[PDB]
Amino acid sequence: NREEKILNREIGFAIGMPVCEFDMVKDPEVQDFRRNILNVCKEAVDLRDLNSPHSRAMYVYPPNVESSPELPKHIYNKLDKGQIIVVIWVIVSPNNDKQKYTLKINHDCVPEQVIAEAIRKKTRSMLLSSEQLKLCVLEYQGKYILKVCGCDEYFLEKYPLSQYKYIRSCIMLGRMPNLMLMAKESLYSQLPMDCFTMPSYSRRTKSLWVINSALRIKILCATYVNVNIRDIDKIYVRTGIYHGGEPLCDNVNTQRVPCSNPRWNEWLNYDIYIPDLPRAARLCLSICSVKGRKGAKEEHCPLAWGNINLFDYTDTLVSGKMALNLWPVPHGLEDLLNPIGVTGSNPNKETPCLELEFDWFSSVVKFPDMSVIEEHANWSVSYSHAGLSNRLARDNELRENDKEQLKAISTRDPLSEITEQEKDFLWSHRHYCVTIPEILPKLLLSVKWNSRDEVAQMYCLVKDWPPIKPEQAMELLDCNYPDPMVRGFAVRCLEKYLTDDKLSQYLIQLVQVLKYEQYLDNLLVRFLLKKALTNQRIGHFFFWHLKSEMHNKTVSQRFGLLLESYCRACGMYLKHLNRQVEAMEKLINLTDILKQEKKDETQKVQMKFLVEQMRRPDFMDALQGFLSPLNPAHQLGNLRLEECRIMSSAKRPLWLNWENPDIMSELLFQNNEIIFKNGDDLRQDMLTLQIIRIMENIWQNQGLDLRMLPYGCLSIGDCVGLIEVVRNSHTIMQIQCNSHTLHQWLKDKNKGEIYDAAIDLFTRSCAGYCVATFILGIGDRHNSNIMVKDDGQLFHIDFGHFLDHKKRERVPFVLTQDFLIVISKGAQECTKTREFERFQEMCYKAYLAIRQHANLFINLFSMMLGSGMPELQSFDDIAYIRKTLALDKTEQEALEYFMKQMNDAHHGGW
Ligand SMILES: Cc1nc(N)nc2c1c(-c1ccc3oc(N)nc3c1)nn2C(C)C
Q1: CATH of domain 206-366
Q2: 796 Cα to the center of ligand 1, angstroms
Q3: Closest CA to 663 of 624, 637, 644
Q4: 881 lines ligand 1 (CB under 6 A)
Q5: Domain named C2 PI3K-type: which ranges?
Q6: Which CATH number fits domain 370-576: 3.40.50.300, 1.25.40.70, 1.10.10.410, 3.10.180.10?
Q7: CB of 504 closer than 6 A to ligand 1?
Q8: 723 lines ligand 1 (CB under 6 A)
């Protein structure tokens, strides 16, 4: 009632649009989605109330843990005989006095064991306890919890201490872990009880195979076709039947009609039997113009496009009259049709609108049940008869060479072309393929989707298909695999095998592939929503990744409806998110004024305006005392206006400084610095930094300590976003204040015995960025986009472009003598040294490690084709990493390729 109305206002503010706009949507799929999704909301809320208060605290403060407890060899060797030195702080009674207790404990210790040891050291001081029963009432390890000093990260779960990311990071970086002992009841009381209420809207036949008929679709007419009368001669509607990006039959065009009167009224006849239509079949169409001629080949041009699901959400074959409001042609679209394009009607109703009519079969036509499919597949099941088809291989037709051939095919990358000979081969040995589970994506592409006899057999294989790795399953969620049985199998693999660490890692791709789903209500969206509602760390970024795309009308309905369901069940976090949403609003509106109104004024004048506007009461209150959208464990306290400035960079980003209000802020960082950028699309940098993080993780698990710096980057909207400021770092140019300048700077910052570790860190970080940039084809490096930390850690900023931005494989990061001098510890002949030989070996080992994980990088890019990123619009863009990783070539041929690219770039040495 009254509390529902208030909540509706809060959800409305969070998503940008009012809840009422969803209520007025006539589409029954939209209303069914809103109602039916509420079961995910109910389920998630029940899990949070399962073991209160702990399970509610676990939702709010989930353990920031690694996927595997097992520690790499070089990380374990950093420990002192498998032990870690940990500092435990206790805030004692008046004036909030801090007391430290340094403990030496096993790296595999449980937080409760860690708490007991700390209370033993605290009670050791009163030697009364020590000798006789130090136990002190089971030490009430259940009365306390460990918090990370300086941020809102808790150790609420029984994991080994080393598995927590903060501790593993402390081990790797040789930093002292500072934890704070906090009373359980002090945290629990801070945590409010969530009151999930069901909204008011929660109250509101023949088989396809029994239709002995070919497909027909009627094109009636078009409206809002506003073309230049002088230019265009005639127009026509081009159509095609597709399963994903692949045609099921030849494309059918209407007759050419003058643009003045677009009225066709033609029944288009297709090369497909209605029972052979696969579940995910779609009509793809476009209004084209035909001009010219000058005595040349007829001048075709697409004006608008549109795609439609041939089956609706209820498995009903689309019948009757239907009008589709079309979309504008995206720049550089090849064919007259756009099958990769989003299925559905343009929300803008003042756009080309094609009126269609489908066939009618005197009954509601529905897609068959799994019982009908199984029976038909079983009913599809001599030597010479099986020999009549290359797509048939009977019992005792599997030699040892064909078994090894199938294995060889399964190792090939996703972008490798699987020939029609190989497709017949894979399909004929489909039952043996079960024994090599990873081959499924190759087998699926070998299926004739325009044949119900084959598809029905494939459905039964997918049903009883063994599980595959989450990373392998993710490929089955891209645009190439539209079938719900295939995608449902992939989601099942993620439900069973994907950790919340890995889910958080790949959340960007998982949010993206939602766009390829046929319907609003599906297994992927339910999986992701449940996770977002059972883990606030996932939910936070799930919210932002969906909100950052709300300005895109192609996905605003789907994402709006999904965000509504999230907000209705996320609990108290909505109130925190709304603070962030408002803070970002104020920053957008302020930067928009500076970018538009005051762009030509002097820095002093711009700063005067900034300071005045930031000191305004409504602004001040909105922009302080909220959680960092980059990491919501980071509290942003009061603004440090004196430290806040307009940056000299293009798009004139704001450098913002907030106080860290944590009691133990001093043991992490006293001030939180963030760059707010308005003008640039941050999606490409977000994806590169994700790939850098993945590459680093690969190397660290392989036992190659090449330290990367994937700093925080979050796109919050249409070319707006946040960038984590790397503390105590400078560009190469802002070091140069000769060739030895850089090395001399690091010598001064790292004097004495620390020098050797600083040079080592430089060489190791340099090697990682050299390999990473070459593979990814990052934008050309220079003195202003290469940075160095005081400790010697080298890293890059402002990526911009990846893959081929030229449009024959560049070396972005060319090592000048400055870098080689530091590597060779001040040598003259820096090339011929025992330090450079070590550095080269790091690069080779790093290069080959990524080459082994090529299928993952290809797949991560492939799932990102759905996003409108300009340098990632086709699989040919992705093919650049096939070149840099030399996948067609052998491992030794790949080393030679890498060495040759480095030799040509540096003009020798390699
Ligand atoms: C992240 C960072 N840390 C530090 N320490 N300094 C820094 C920076 C940055 C910066 C700014 C905007 C960026 O957009 C992308 N994609 N990467 C960026 C890096 N610039 N500077 C200089 C220019 C002040």
Answers
A1: 2.60.40.150
A2: 9
A3: 637
A4: no
A5: 211-368
A6: 1.25.40.70
A7: no
A8: yes
